Design a protein around this ligand. Sequence first.
Ligand SMILES: Cc1cc2nc3c(=O)[nH]c(=O)nc-3n(C[C@H](O)[C@H](O)[C@H](O)COP(=O)(O)O)c2cc1C
Length: 117
Amino acid sequence: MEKNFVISDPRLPDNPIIFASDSFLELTEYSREEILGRNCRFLQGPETDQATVQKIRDAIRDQREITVQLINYTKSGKKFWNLFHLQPMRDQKGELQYFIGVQLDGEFIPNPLLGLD
Ligand SMILES: Cc1cc2nc3c(=O)[nH]c(=O)nc-3n(C[C@H](O)[C@H](O)[C@H](O)COP(=O)(O)O)c2cc1C
């Protein structure tokens, strides 16, 4: 099955991407070489709701799983709705090791209802 995902290392400065799936690269139109080491906020742009970005920032702080829908942009500037699922990954001793972020492309939640959040 097709899997859009990236893995970040929160033990390195500003939670850089250390792995991006082929499907993620195809969705976003970026090369692997040009996004390794980036914070995944590079997918955001003007239309991205900063209230939703705050919800992600809080979930990362608390190391809790969250799903949000927000506007992201391809390399060529095409807007897409991203239903984004964040999962903390802990080592055998319960210490945070990675985050994995899974992206589903689509306006799953209609914008008019999303706006009631
Ligand atoms: C593993 C992982 C994957 C992420 N994937 C996305 C994404 O696909 N789209 C997006 O807008 N933000 C994504 N983010 C969120 C941003 O990297 C960042 O955490 C968010 O914008 C909140 O922090 P900031 O206020 O410092 O930007 C992801 C974060 C992590 C840790």
